[PDB]
Amino acid sequence: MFNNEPLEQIDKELHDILADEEKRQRETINLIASENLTNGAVRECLGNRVSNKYSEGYPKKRYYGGNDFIDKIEELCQKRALEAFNVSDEEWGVNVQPLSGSAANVQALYALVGVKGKIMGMHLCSGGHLTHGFFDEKKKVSITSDMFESKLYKCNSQGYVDLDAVREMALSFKPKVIICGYTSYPRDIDYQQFRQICDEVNAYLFADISHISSFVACNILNNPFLHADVVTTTTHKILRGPRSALIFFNKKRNPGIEQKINSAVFPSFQGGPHNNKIAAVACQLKEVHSPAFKEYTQQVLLNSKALAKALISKQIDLVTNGTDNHLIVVDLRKFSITGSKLQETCNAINVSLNKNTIPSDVDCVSPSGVRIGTPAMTTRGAKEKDMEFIADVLARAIKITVDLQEQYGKKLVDFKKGLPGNAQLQQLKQEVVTWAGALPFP
Amino acid sequence: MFNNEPLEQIDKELHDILADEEKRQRETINLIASENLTNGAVRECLGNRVSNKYSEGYPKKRYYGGNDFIDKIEELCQKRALEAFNVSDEEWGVNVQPLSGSAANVQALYALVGVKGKIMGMHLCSGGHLTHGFFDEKKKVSITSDMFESKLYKCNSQGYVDLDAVREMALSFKPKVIICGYTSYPRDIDYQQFRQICDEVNAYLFADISHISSFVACNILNNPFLHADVVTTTTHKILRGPRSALIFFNKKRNPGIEQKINSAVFPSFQGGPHNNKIAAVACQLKEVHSPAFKEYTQQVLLNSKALAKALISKQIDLVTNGTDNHLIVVDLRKFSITGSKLQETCNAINVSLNKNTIPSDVDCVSPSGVRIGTPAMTTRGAKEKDMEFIADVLARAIKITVDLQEQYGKKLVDFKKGLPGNAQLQQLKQEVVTWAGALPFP
Ligand SMILES: COC(=O)c1ccc(-c2cc(C#N)cc([C@@]3(C(C)C)C(C#N)=C(N)Oc4n[nH]c(C)c43)c2)s1
Ligand SMILES: COC(=O)c1ccc(-c2cc(C#N)cc([C@@]3(C(C)C)C(C#N)=C(N)Oc4n[nH]c(C)c43)c2)s1
Numbered sequence: 001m002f003n004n005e006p007l008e009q010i011d012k013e014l015h016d017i018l019a020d021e022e023k024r025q026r027e028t029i030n031l032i033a034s035e036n037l038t039n040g041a042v043r044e045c046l047g048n049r050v051s052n053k054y055s056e057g058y059p060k061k062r063y064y065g066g067n068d069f070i071d072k073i074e075e076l077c078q079k080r081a082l083e084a085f086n087v088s089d090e091e092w093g094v095n096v097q098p099l100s101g102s103a104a105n106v107q108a109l110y111a112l113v114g115v116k117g118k119i120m121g122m123h124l125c126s127g128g129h130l131t132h133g134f135f136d137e138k139k140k141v142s143i144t145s146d147m148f149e150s151k152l153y154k155c156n157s158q159g160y161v162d163l164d165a166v167r168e169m170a171l172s173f174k175p176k177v178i179i180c181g182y183t184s185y186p187r188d189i190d191y192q193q194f195r196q197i198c199d200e201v202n203a204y205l206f207a208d209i210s211h212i213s214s215f216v217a218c219n220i221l222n223n224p225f226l227h228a229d230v231v232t233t234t235t236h237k238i239l240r241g242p243r244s245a246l247i248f249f250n251k252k253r254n255p256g257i258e259q260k261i262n263s264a265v266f267p268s269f270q271g272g273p274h275n276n277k278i279a280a281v282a283c284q285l286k287e288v289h290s291p292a293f294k295e296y297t298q299q300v301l302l303n304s305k306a307l308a309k310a311l312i313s314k315q316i317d318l319v320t321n322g323t324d325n326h327l328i329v330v331d332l333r334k335f336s337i338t339g340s341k342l343q344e345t346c347n348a349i350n351v352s353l354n355k356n357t358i359p360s361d362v363d364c365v366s367p368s369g370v371r372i373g374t375p376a377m378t379t380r381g382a383k384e385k386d387m388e389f390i391a392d393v394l395a396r397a398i399k400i401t402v403d404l405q406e407q408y409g410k411k412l413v414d415f416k417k418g419l420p421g422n423a424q425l426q427q428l429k430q431e432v433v434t435w436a437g438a439l440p441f442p
Numbered sequence: 443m444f445n446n447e448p449l450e451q452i453d454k455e456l457h458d459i460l461a462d463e464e465k466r467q468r469e470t471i472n473l474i475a476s477e478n479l480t481n482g483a484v485r486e487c488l489g490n491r492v493s494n495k496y497s498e499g500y501p502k503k504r505y506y507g508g509n510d511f512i513d514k515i516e517e518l519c520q521k522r523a524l525e526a527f528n529v530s531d532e533e534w535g536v537n538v539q540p541l542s543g544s545a546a547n548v549q550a551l552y553a554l555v556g557v558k559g560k561i562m563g564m565h566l567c568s569g570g571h572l573t574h575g576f577f578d579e580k581k582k583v584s585i586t587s588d589m590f591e592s593k594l595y596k597c598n599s600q601g602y603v604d605l606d607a608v609r610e611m612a613l614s615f616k617p618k619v620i621i622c623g624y625t626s627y628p629r630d631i632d633y634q635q636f637r638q639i640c641d642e643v644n645a646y647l648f649a650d651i652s653h654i655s656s657f658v659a660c661n662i663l664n665n666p667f668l669h670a671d672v673v674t675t676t677t678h679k680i681l682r683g684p685r686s687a688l689i690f691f692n693k694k695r696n697p698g699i700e701q702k703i704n705s706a707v708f709p710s711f712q713g714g715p716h717n718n719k720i721a722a723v724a725c726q727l728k729e730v731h732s733p734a735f736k737e738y739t740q741q742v743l744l745n746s747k748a749l750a751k752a753l754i755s756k757q758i759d760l761v762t763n764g765t766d767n768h769l770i771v772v773d774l775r776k777f778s779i780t781g782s783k784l785q786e787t788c789n790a791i792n793v794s795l796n797k798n799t800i801p802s803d804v805d806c807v808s809p810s811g812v813r814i815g816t817p818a819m820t821t822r823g824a825k826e827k828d829m830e831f832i833a834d835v836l837a838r839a840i841k842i843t844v845d846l847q848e849q850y851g852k853k854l855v856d857f858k859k860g861l862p863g864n865a866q867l868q869q870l871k872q873e874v875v876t877w878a879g880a881l882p883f884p
């Protein structure tokens with residue numbers, strides 16, 4: 001007793017905006033480090049009827065039957081995750097039901113520590129995620145700072161993790177979990193030294209590798225699996241999967257972590273799984289293991305190294321003066337402009353990037369940087385030669401921002417008033433749209 | 443640098459299970475009360491490229507830009523939600539980012555009370571959801587029982603909400619939230635009475651209409667908006683949308699609950715929203731408001747009324763001896779078989795249903811009932827006349843179960859041993875599949 005008209009006919013208002021979004025995405029130099037583009041195969045999963053199914057519990061331990069084919073899919077997804085991260089399904093378990101990275105972290109953290117639980121994570125301003133225990137003085141911003149007791153370590157003035165400060169913190173504060181793996185961190189991680197600090201204080205090692213998952217998979221970067229009790233990743237970023245999360249747990253290092261974590265996901269926090277998510281993670285995970293995806297990951301780093309290089313060739317300062325991964329955080333201080341200002345300037349020329357804090361920063365408001373990353377563009381067929389152009393565009397943006405601030409004022413309200421109608425921005429968007437509009441597009 | 447190979451050629455392994463799943467669904471009499479089937483237009487959103495975007499924040503207040511088209515998509519969703527639930531956007535707000543009902547409830551609960559806060563909800567065994575503060579003696583099973591201090595009210599032997607008990611409890615325990623709205627409850631709710639007890643104790647009124655959302659929209663059942671501070675609903679059940687949730691808040695009764703609820707969702711709990719969810723919800727919410735969907739909802743109840751009647755005509759006991767909504771809970775005591783067994787008997791014949799507790803029950807294992815509902819089959823186009831046949835199938839299932847329990851014993855695996863190859867179940871399956879396979883399938 002339903003309507004079966006396609007989306008164009010059924011809701012013309014919506015289909016318009018979705019085709020507009022398509023065009024915007026197609027005609028953008030997308031530098032959001034956390035973004036990517038899924039193929040049609042993954043979206044065919046997310047669009048699949050497999051999501052009609054309530055399948056609470058676990059495969060072979062459902063509450064309902066009729067989950068014959070769902071069980072197979074959940075199992076295939078777990079088979080492939082551990083396969084793809086080169087871990088033995090005898091030493092490592094994986095949960096494939098978490099709905100997103102933020103849910104997975106909260107869930108996994110709760111499993112290890114529980115309420116009033118003590119956790120250590122990197123501060124937001126230093127490159128840590130909200131779910132790593134973020135608070136301001138006035139408010140416990142993340143549940144992770146509220147349902148848990150959280151202390152936060154900073155990076156040094158040069159933007160690097162200070163393992164010394166972690167020790168000072170870990171030994172005195174004495175937490176049950178220490179979190180490593182970050183949201184805007186341009187360098188690789190010394191996990192082994194984290195393992196060294198965790199042992200010293202009997203803490204669990206939590207590695208959230210959401211930004212760098214593919215590197216870890218493709219053995220391009222350090223392996224946290226060698227040293228960590230839990231590892232969480234999102235699937236929608238560099239892994240180029242759907243929006244979802246995976247929780248990995250070392251059965252060997254702490255048996256009965258399986259039940260602990262499998263129950264945190266359900267019934268502690270979640271209800272029915274989203275099978276279309278699961279089905280899509282399955283789909284992307286097949287691709288992850290292939291040596292073709294390894295080419296793509298290498299390409300991401302090649303592009304990032306080249307981009308960093310090209311930005312430095314133009315007298316632009318980077319934090320840590322470079323990158324080990326897919327991401328660069330530009331320091332804007334020498335230019336006397338905010339990341340807030342530059343983000344707007346880039347939006348006007350169809351350049352997606354986000355503002356970001358740096359180490360000298362004191363507020364999440366008025367931050368002195370932007371964060372770019374290469375996974376999306378790499379996916380669109382861009383190579384190292386193309387990086388000079390993006391660098392060129394970012395430099396021009398920066399110059400135009402400096403000009404517009406001089407003409408309208410350091411006040412953001414004022415500044416944006418200078419943005420529309422501007423001759424050079426229209427010129428630059430145009431060049432951007434020209435080049436962007438014609439690259440490969442899943 | 444991607445593969446655009448379609449699903450059938452990219453991952454043959456997976457496509458097959460999805461094709462198998464598709465077939466099972468097409469050939470099943472689905473009586474899972476919480477299930478439904480989405481049209482191809484809602485699946486077209488879930489598959490849309492809009493999920494590429496990271497848009498942490500709220501519309502007009504993102505942390506990024508290039509959210510021009512997403513802000514519109516999110517805005518149209520909140521418009522249509524408040525429309526559909528017939529509430530004024532001046533009086534009520536809605537959050538459209540919760541990833542599923544359990545996240546929404548956890549989020550909304552937190553917003554109202556926060557850590558170590560006091561909540562009251564119906565017990566699981568009495569019809570309550572896990573997210574309404576469920577614990578057992580041995581463990582706090584839901585986070586809602588652990589990150590909150592929860593107390594649980596039971597229905598009377600008759601299977602109805604004992605409002606006396608709720609006051610006896612609310613006045614002594616004195617919680618800050620009371621939750622009503624249930625997972626397996628066959629009758630309508632007296633919300634006013636709930637409003638009356640909440641006022642006496644200065645508590646919030648939490649109404650979870652996930653199972654009955656459509657009724658309430660279409661004005662077939664009591665309206666919780668008249669009395670409630672928060673209203674949560676999932677969107678994939680009777681509403682027949684994608685898997686997602688809505689949180690509704692009364693601004694006039696509770697000013698500044700907006701920021702409280704909006705910040706609970708992000709950044710307290712979640713990260714990026716899932717814009718395909720949002721896009722799909724929008725799509726369905728348009729459909730919800732049409733006079734045509736009111737037809738479907740009326741049809742649901744018509745069917746459930748007919749099914750109940752038909753079941754009673756066959757000497758089958760229902761809890762509350764009937765239904766006000768889409769769901770029936772059969773009491774199985776006169777037959778001396780558990781729900782668990784009958785579920786198994788039914789899965790064998792492509793009848794999907796679920797074991798459910800009753801008032802006499804004292805364990806969530808070996809419960810004395812099955813919960814059935816009509817939303818899915820009504821979707822297939824079943825009418826009141828078709829309800830005798832389903833009643834007929836369930837009666838026969840119940841009979842065959844008593845036979846198998848007699849032959850192989852009261853123990854589960856033993857009971858299962860009789861299940862495969864049984865002459866009568868094969869005739870009944872065929873019979874099921876024949877009638878089901880030929881019904882309209884979105
Ligand atoms: C009370 O809530 C808050 O104060 C905040 C919530 C989100 C905040 C934030 C602000 C900026 C800035 N400027 C940047 C972020 C990042 C960005 C990647 C977008 C961030 C940084 N810098 C880091 N490190 O982590 C993040 N997690 N989520 C988001 C949006 C961010 C978050 S501040
Ligand atoms: C430690 O975890 C547990 O004990 C349980 C988890 C889920 C449990 C459960 C058991 C049964 C049975 N029999 C039924 C449920 C229902 C069913 C609708 C599936 C339920 C009932 N009865 C109610 N009312 O609420 C529910 N929320 N989620 C699920 C699966 C259920 C939950 S018990």
Ligand SMILES: Cc1ncc(COP(=O)(O)O)c(CNCC(=O)O)c1O
Pocket residue numbers: 033034100101102103129181182183184208209210211234244496712713714
């Ligand atoms: C370390 C980390 N963990 C989790 C998440 C995100 O979880 P969700 O899937 O719930 O958003 C992010 C992305 N953070 C935002 C960014 O990089 O832009 C992250 O960087």
Ligand SMILES: Cc1ncc(COP(=O)(O)O)c(CNCC(=O)O)c1O
Pocket residue numbers: 054270271272475476542543544545571573623624625626650652653676686
């Ligand atoms: C009252 C209530 N709230 C929330 C949920 C489910 O939340 P998720 O969308 O996160 O699964 C249910 C369904 N519960 C299971 C059922 O009826 O089968 C429910 O009955």
Ligand SMILES: [Cl-]
Pocket residue numbers: 046274276277488716718719
């Ligand atoms: Cl989804």
